[PDB]
Amino acid sequence: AMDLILINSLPLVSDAETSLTCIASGWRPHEPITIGRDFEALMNQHQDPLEVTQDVTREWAKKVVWKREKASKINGAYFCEGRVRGEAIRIRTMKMRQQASFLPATLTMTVDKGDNVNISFKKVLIKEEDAVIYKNGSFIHSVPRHEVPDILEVHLPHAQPQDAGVYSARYIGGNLFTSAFTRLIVRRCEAQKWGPECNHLCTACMNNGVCHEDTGECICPPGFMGRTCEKACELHTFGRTCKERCSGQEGCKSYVFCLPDPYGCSCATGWKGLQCNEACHPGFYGPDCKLRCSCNNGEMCDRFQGCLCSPGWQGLQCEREGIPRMTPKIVDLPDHIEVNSGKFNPICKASGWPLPTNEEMTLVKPDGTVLHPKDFNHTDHFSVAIFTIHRILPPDSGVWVCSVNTVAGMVEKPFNISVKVLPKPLNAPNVIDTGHNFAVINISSEPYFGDGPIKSKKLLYKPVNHYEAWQHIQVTNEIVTLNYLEPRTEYELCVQLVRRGEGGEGHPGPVRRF
Amino acid sequence: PFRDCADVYQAGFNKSGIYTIYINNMPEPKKVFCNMDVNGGGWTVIQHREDGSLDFQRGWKEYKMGFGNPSGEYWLGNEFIFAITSQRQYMLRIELMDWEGNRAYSQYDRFHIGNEKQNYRLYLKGHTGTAGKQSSLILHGADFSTKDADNDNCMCKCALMLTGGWWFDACGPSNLNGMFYTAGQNHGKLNGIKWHYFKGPSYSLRSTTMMIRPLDF
Numbered sequence: 252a253m254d255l256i257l258i259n260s261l262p263l264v265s266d267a268e269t270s271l272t273c274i275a276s277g278w279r280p281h282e283p284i285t286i287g288r289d290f291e292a293l294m295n296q297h298q299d300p301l302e303v304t305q306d307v308t309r310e311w312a313k314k315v316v317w318k319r320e321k322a323s324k325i326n327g328a329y330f331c332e333g334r335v336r337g338e339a340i341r342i343r344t345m346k347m348r349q350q351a352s353f354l355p356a357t358l359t360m361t362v363d364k365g366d367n368v369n370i371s372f373k374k375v376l377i378k379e380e381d382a383v384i385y386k387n388g389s390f391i392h393s394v395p396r397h398e399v400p401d402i403l404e405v406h407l408p409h410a411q412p413q414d415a416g417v418y419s420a421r422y423i424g425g426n427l428f429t430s431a432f433t434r435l436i437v438r439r440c441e442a443q444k445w446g447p448e449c450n451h452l453c454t455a456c457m458n459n460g461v462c463h464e465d466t467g468e469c470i471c472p473p474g475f476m477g478r479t480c481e482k483a484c485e486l487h488t489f490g491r492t493c494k495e496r497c498s499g500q501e502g503c504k505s506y507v508f509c510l511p512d513p514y515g516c517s518c519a520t521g522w523k524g525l526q527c528n529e530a531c532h533p534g535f536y537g538p539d540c541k542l543r544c545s546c547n548n549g550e551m552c553d554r555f556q557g558c559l560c561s562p563g564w565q566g567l568q569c570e571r572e573g574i575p576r577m578t579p580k581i582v583d584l585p586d587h588i589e590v591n592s593g594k595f596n597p598i599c600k601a602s603g604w605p606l607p608t609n610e611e612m613t614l615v616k617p618d619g620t621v622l623h624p625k626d627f628n629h630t631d632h633f634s635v636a637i638f639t640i641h642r643i644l645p646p647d648s649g650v651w652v653c654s655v656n657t658v659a660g661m662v663e664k665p666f667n668i669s670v671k672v673l674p675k676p677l678n679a680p681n682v683i684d685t686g687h688n689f690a691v692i693n694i695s696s697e698p699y700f701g702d703g704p705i706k707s708k709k710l711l712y713k714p715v716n717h718y719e720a721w722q723h724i725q726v727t728n729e730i731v732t733l734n735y736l737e738p739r740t741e742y743e744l745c746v747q748l749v750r751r752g753e754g755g756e757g758h759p760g761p762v763r764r765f
Numbered sequence: 766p767f768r769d770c771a772d773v774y775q776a777g778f779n780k781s782g783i784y785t786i787y788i789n790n791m792p793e794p795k796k797v798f799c800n801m802d803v804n805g806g807g808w809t810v811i812q813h814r815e816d817g818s819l820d821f822q823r824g825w826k827e828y829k830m831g832f833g834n835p836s837g838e839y840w841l842g843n844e845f846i847f848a849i850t851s852q853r854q855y856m857l858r859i860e861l862m863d864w865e866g867n868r869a870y871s872q873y874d875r876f877h878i879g880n881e882k883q884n885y886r887l888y889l890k891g892h893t894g895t896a897g898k899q900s901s902l903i904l905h906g907a908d909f910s911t912k913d914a915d916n917d918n919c920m921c922k923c924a925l926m927l928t929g930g931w932w933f934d935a936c937g938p939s940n941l942n943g944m945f946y947t948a949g950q951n952h953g954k955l956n957g958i959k960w961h962y963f964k965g966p967s968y969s970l971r972s973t974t975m976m977i978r979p980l981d982f
Contacts, residue, residue, distance in 0.1 A: 379935060380919055380920065380921070380935040380936075381935050381936055389953070390953065390954070390955035390967065391953055391955075391966075391967050392955075392965065392966035392967040393955075393966050395934075395937070395938045395961065396934055396935040396936075423919075423921060423926075423935065423936060424919060424920050424921025424935075425921075
């Protein structure tokens with residue numbers, strides 16, 4: 252329904268420039284990307300209308316470049332919204348003096364309700380005042396001048412969910428801006444627990460994935476996908492479905508990524524450090540290099556992807572043999588649609604060896620709602636999913652997408668749907684000739700109330716007692732002999748479109764007798 | 766013609782109350798509050814906080830002569846506390862209490878402060894007591910600061926950050942003359958009435974009371 256990525260081109264400001272690029276993977280149109288200062292999570296920021304220009308290295312993205320030296324009032328926290336159907340979505344980062352006095356040793360922490368956490372800062376620029384700790388821009392506590400540790404710690408045991416946000420650290424006699432910033436995320440439930448009360452369990456997400464506490468699905472680290480984040484996404488690619496490219500010739504050795512709130516921020520997979528400048532020490536591979544290689548039979552270790560199994564083995568650690576699991580592909584979808592306005596049963600077809608199950612198959616209304624399978628066929632290859640809409644109308648005319656998300660990948664394909672309205676004629680028919688046993692009539696129906704191409708015309712008739720009708724019509728002006736003698740008759744015109752809902756009401760109508 | 770509460774107790778008065786002490790080369794007394802129960806009695810109270818009736822955010826001239834009432838919340842006055850610790854050598858105790866109903870005390874063997882041209886500079890020694898292992902007041906001293914005296918060994922202005930008047934290092938680990946915080950606010954407040962090695966930097970305590978009597982008792 253929405254793929255929103257926040258790119259921080261290095262969160263540590265020097266004299267050179269830094270930049271914030273907010274990327275959306277969407278299409279027709281492009282929901283207005285907000286980028287503003289994040290005044291809530293760090294109060295007392297200095298207010299400045301920041302210029303949101305547009306970015307052109309990608310399909311749709313807006314970027315905020317402060318130019319070298321003018322990197323002044325940029326200290327603070329920031330955000331970008333992307334939204335969907337009444338539902339929002341925002342990703343939060345920070346920007347700070349490279350100098351400053353301290354260094355958060357990590358921009359965000361993802362921790363679960365009731366964990367002991369050690370929120371730190373490396374002590375850099377030693378001065379003869381005290382150290383101080385600020386969350387939400389509200390005061391906490393500090394450190395006397397002479398007993399200032401080397402790693403300024405803050406211990407929080409059994410962290411509650413109302414106990415998180417952005418943390419500061421400065422040398423007392425200082426700016427709310429000379430500080431150093433770290434963000435703390437505490438989810439409603441403990442790890443591997445999610446739901447509106449904590450009574451369900453997460454899709455277990457490998458590769459350092461983080462399990463959303465609202466959906467039980469996983470927000471994957473950049474360069475990995477699936478529901479369980481297990482998928483070795485291509486070289487120098489990121490996102491939900493890994494269709495996006497790192498610009499820089501050495502890949503992502505300076506892009507700090509940032510993800511939907513339940514995750515936080517991190518380097519591309521292959522990069523250790525605060526600036527992602529640092530290569531990963533051998534035997535480690537994940538995002539920040541936080542994943543250790545447990546390759547069973549000694550297969551090479553890749554700083555980008557993990558275990559490089561010998562042919563015929565696959566798995567996190569080459570701990571399983573089997574057919575090489577293939578990522579799904581949405582098959583026999585066309586580019587264009589045009590259906591007529593009524594009940595509607597749309598059909599997604601997806602190949603792949605993980606062979607989708609209707610849990611894993613969805614559809615997205617142009618507005619951005621998720622629709623789930625009302626039934627499931629299947630076959631040998633290709634699971635097949637069928638959906639239903641109440642009445643589909645001409646305002647749902649736009650792009651819709653098939654979402655297939657199995658354990659060894661995610662794919663999406665689109666189709667432009669042009670809902671057309673039914674005909675219905677404008678005018679009554681007009682009567683040409685009367686008589687004892689017959690009548691003749693101008694079928695109106697050249698002025699017609701809707702649109703489309705008209706394919707059959709059917710003639711309707713009744714007395715005043717019951718219903719009947721008919722006659723599939725092949726010239727505009729019509730002759731119904733074999734009639735009674737003196738009845739009141741009622742005549743209605745009824746037009747037709749292209750397949751499915753093509754009936755479409757009649758109104759018109761005159762009356763006669765002989 | 767007696768000059769502190771220890772004399773009041775020598776003279777047989779074993780009850781706590783308001784008394785009047787006259788000071789040497791001080792023409793004109795001061796009503797004070799004498800504490801006669803603690804340890805052995807004979808204590809002379811230089812400041813009392815318990816409710817926050819009184820505002821501690823004041824200037825030199827105000828902190829010089831003292832304010833508040835000896836009955837409820839108060840401060841003695843520095844040209845008094847100075848005028849009293851030049852007569853001899855005094856010991857210092859400090860009576861804390863948080864909101865969960867918990868006494869504590871720091872207690873110091875030597876205590877003296879220099880004059881007005883010396884910024885009532887702090888000179889303590891021998892920190893004992895339940896209020897932390899280490900001394901939450903700085904013993905070696907730096908000068909006394911108020912809202913119109915940047916005297917702290919800090920570069921900022923430590924009066925107008927921690928409120929009132931106290932002995933500010935680069936903002937020391939204490940401020941019993943700060944901001945009175947009621948029950949509930951008393952968590953996570955910084956310019957509060959604090960004492961590090963006891964209840965934590967972000968606490969605002971409940972009932973402080975600083976006091977002196979001479980060594981010899």
